[PDB]
Ligand binder design. Structure first.
Ligand code: PZF
Ligand SMILES: *[C@@H]1O[C@H](CO)[C@@H](O[C@@H]2O[C@H](CO)[C@@H](O)[C@H](O)[C@H]2NC(C)=O)[C@H](O)[C@H]1NC(C)=O
Ligand SMILES: *[C@@H]1O[C@H](CO)[C@@H](O[C@@H]2O[C@H](CO)[C@@H](O)[C@H](O)[C@H]2NC(C)=O)[C@H](O)[C@H]1NC(C)=O
Ligand code: NAG
Length: 728
């Protein structure tokens, strides 16, 4: 048809997917921001009113980064002065604005460089972390209560996580959990005293004459890890004159005999907390249930309430143990667990009883449980049509497990196969969000008889624009390795002609529990490559991949760098035997784990690939952090798994790169996958006389996400691909 989807279109966000981000504030109302107004919507009728005009803060004098309205409507938190730290951490300033009095609170303000602020879940108490210590404000205009006195930069963290807990365990900076009531505040304390530091140079603005050395406690594989403690404070009995009493909850005997992690914290009732702990050998976990004792003011954890979840074939959970969903009474809960055959299904547990009752089964997986009411459990799975890369909402009747209703499967089957959901409080209403394979579609629904109420956002604007672009298509299908089905996706150029040979770029992640073949709709680099440059972009899910059971997922156990790499080479050979692929023009590329896979494939000597790009790769597992590495790899000791640590490096394959054109890219301020990793790759290739191309990105981290760098890397990569494929 007409213009194609260009690199610039991608780089400059020319064709924008619209979203419908709402925030539930009750069982029947949400907040939504429709151009410099906050609107409140009524879910049942769809009427709205303006909550707050942005004009309110025209003369506030600071650019407001975000906001948080107190659950009771009384106050809004204003976040400005935002400074990114790692993936989820950042610091900021905070002003509180009283919505009834229509004025800023000017007394007893939150300090600058506050690390974390949370409202209680009810009312308007605040808890915040400043200088690695926790402070609680009962009223926003009143002086705070200091909870901890031990916070120490780089060493003791109260209520916030250190580097590896942020990245690998909680996926959050916060380590503060209010009870449902707001009576108790639970928090974790991390101790990094002997964790070694990664050090790297930060060059900063050109005006900085001497570069800065950034130092971060970061346990690489096998190193000393942070230790953790857990504490609960009663915030309804705090004194101005007497220091706050925090009650410690210790980890079970079965954990305390060695290194372990706190891997999950979930309140069950107003006086019951559940804690999951994990051994540093991540094949064994324990859930504790801890009940408050009114008489002593302490927390007791009966050994008979401990639930064990262990694996005999791999590790526990997909990334970590799944979280429990408690019945309103707190005497039982639902959790996703791997069943006798390897499939992740919902299990029913009652608190002072042994076993558990599986309420789903089949050759598919539950992705997550989304809501629990007295009659139904709402969950997301990939059962529909046996497509591991599709996602649908279901409900199961708690009085009869055979009564499962798919709630999303047939709302719009050609356009919609990949749903997520957001339930109101008490799950009276839900927003469904489909992400593919058509354009995203956002809808509101009522849980009573599962009636559609309202289309929220249908992306009709974007639909119309794309009718005007020569858009590529997605093929989603499967091949067979060894009597098992493995799924792959292909991005095909517009006006695809199977009697012509196309160049193929293999897009790789292939990390454990990854999935790269799915029904999601994306506008990305592959879109450009297929639409303008007529390259087929393919992605393949082999051994190690997720959402198809443990047999596939755990094939890679103690063995990273093997089956997941072979499987990509094999997928490529099978793509090249289908007759529309030019087998003298196959390339490969990947980021993070995919850059480790790309390098191991280029270094395999297979002869399949002409060229490849590795961005921020791992090169050797001893360099990456302990929590993630040791999950898949055990420990790099001779009593454990040192030999496969040494056989799984990129560097050992250096000679083989003389058969391929390789482009290696890394940001110098990468705090996650250290520049060290690529420095050691380059050094091995030079020692062996292999020529290659490189690019460093000064001061960029693992996402290489600053917008000029993002643009420059995708541009640099597109030239490399064009040249390797003799494309004009
Ligand atoms: C419910 O809590 C969950 C659930 C899922 C995940 C999760 C983690 C994850 N990771 C990939 C990342 C990573 C791995 C590399 F090999 C690498 F080179 C760089 C890199 F950033 C790991 N730090 C963690 N990827 C997808 N999902 C994390 N938390
Ligand atoms: C949706 O419409 C209803 C009905 O007009 C609003 O309900 C009224 O709300 C105001 C403030 O809550 C009350 O003083 C009225 O007396 C209510 N009347 C009735 C008949 O319900 C509701 O406020 C609207 N909701 C939104 C979100 O704008
Ligand atoms: C959890 O961690 C380790 C590693 O897989 C297991 O300990 C090994 O047990 C196997 C049994 O197949 C022995 O052959 C090895 O000699 C042990 N290796 C080491 C270094 O300890 C342990 O079995 C796992 N636990 C579970 C529940 O399966
Ligand atoms: C919240 O729970 C605590 C402990 O059960 C109790 O003391 C307090 O009264 C509760 N707050 C409410 C619901 O008013």
């Amino acid at each position: 048809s007409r213009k194609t989807y260009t690199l610039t279109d991608y780089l400059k966000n020319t064709y924008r997917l619209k979203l419908y981000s709402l925030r539930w504030i009750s069982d029947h109302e949400y907040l939504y921001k429709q151009e410099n107004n906050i609107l409140v919507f009524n879910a049942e009728y769809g009427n709205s009113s303006v909550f707050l005009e942005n004009s309110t803060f025209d003369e506030f004098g600071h650019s407001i980064n975000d906001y948080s309205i107190s659950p009771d409507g009384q106050f809004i938190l204003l976040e400005y002065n935002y400074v990114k730290q790692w993936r989820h951490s950042y610091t900021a300033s905070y002003d509180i604005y009283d919505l009834n009095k229509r004025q800023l609170i000017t007394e007893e303000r939150i300090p600058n460089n506050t690390q974390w602020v949370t409202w209680s879940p009810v009312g308007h108490k605040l808890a915040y972390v400043w200088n690695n210590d926790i402070y609680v404000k009962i009223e926003p205009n009143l002086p705070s209560y200091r909870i901890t006195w031990t916070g120490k930069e780089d060493i003791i963290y109260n209520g916030i996580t250190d580097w590896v807990y942020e990245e690998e365990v909680f996926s959050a900076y916060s380590a503060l959990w209010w009870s449902p009531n707001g009576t108790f505040l639970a928090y974790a304390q991390f101790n990094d005293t002997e964790v070694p530091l990664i050090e790297y140079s930060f060059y900063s603005d050109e005006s900085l004459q001497y570069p800065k050395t950034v130092r971060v406690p970061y346990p690489k594989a096998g190193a000393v890890n942070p230790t953790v403690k857990f504490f609960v404070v009663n915030t309804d009995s705090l004194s101005s004159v007497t220091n706050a009493t925090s009650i410690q909850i210790t980890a079970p005997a079965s954990m305390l005999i060695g290194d372990h992690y706190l891997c999950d914290v979930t309140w069950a009732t107003q006086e019951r907390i559940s804690l999951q702990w994990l051994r540093r050998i991540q094949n064994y976990s324990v859930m504790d249930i801890c009940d408050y004792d009114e008489s002593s003011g302490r927390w007791n954890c009966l050994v008979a309430r401990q639930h064990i979840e262990m694996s005999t074939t791999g590790w526990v959970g997909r990334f970590r143990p799944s979280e429990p969903h408690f019945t309103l009474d707190g005497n039982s809960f639902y959790k996703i667990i791997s069943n006798e055959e390897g499939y992740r299904h919902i299990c029913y547990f009652q608190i002072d009883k042994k076993d558990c009752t599986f309420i789903t089964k089949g050759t598919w997986e539950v992705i997550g449980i989304e809501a629990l009411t007295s009659d139904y459990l709402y969950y997301i799975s990939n059962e529909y049509k046996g497509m591991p890369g599709g996602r649908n909402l279901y409900k199961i009747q708690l009085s009869d497990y055979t009564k499962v209703t798919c709630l999303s499967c047939e709302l719009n089957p050609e356009r919609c196969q990949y749903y997520s959901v957001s339930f109101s409080k008490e799950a009276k209403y839900y927003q469904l969000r489909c992400s593919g394979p058509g354009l995203p579609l956002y809808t509101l629904h009522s849980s009573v008889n599962d009636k559609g109420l309202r289309v929220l956002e249908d992306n009709s604007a974007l639909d119309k624009m794309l009718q005007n672009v020569q858009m590529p298509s997605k093929k989603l299908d499967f091949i067979i390795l060894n009597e098992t089905k493995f799924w792959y996706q292909m991005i095909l150029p517009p006006h695809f002609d199977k009697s012509k040979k196309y160049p193929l770029l293999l897009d790789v992640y292939a990390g454990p529990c990854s999935q790269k073949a799915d029904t999601v709709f994306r506008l990305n680099w592959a879109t450009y490559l297929a639409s303008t440059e007529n390259i087929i972009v393919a992605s393949f899910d082999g051994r190690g991949s997720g959402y198809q059971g443990d047999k596939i997922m755990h094939a890679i156990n103690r063995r990273l760098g093997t089956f997941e790499v072979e499987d990509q080479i094999e997928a490529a050979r099978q793509f090249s035997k289908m007759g529309f692929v030019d087998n003298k023009r196959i390339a490969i590329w990947g980021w993070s784990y995919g850059g480790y896979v790309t390098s191991m494939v280029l270094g395999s000597g297979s002869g399949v690939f002409k060229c490849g790009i590795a961005v921020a790769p791992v090169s050797r597992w001893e360099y990456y952090d302990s929590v993630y590495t040791e999950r898949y790899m055990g420990l790099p000791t001779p009593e454990d798994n040192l030999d496969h640590y040494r056989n799984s490096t990129v560097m050992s394959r250096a000679e083989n790169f003389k058969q391929v054109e390789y482009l290696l890219i890394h940001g110098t301020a990468d705090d996650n996958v250290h520049f060290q990793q690529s420095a050691q790759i380059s050094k091995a290739l030079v020692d062996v006389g292999v020529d290659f191309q490189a690019m460093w990105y000064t001061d960029e981290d693992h996402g290489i996400a600053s917008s000029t760098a993002h643009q420059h890397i995708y541009t640099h990569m597109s030239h490399f691909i064009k040249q390797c494929f003799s494309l004009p």
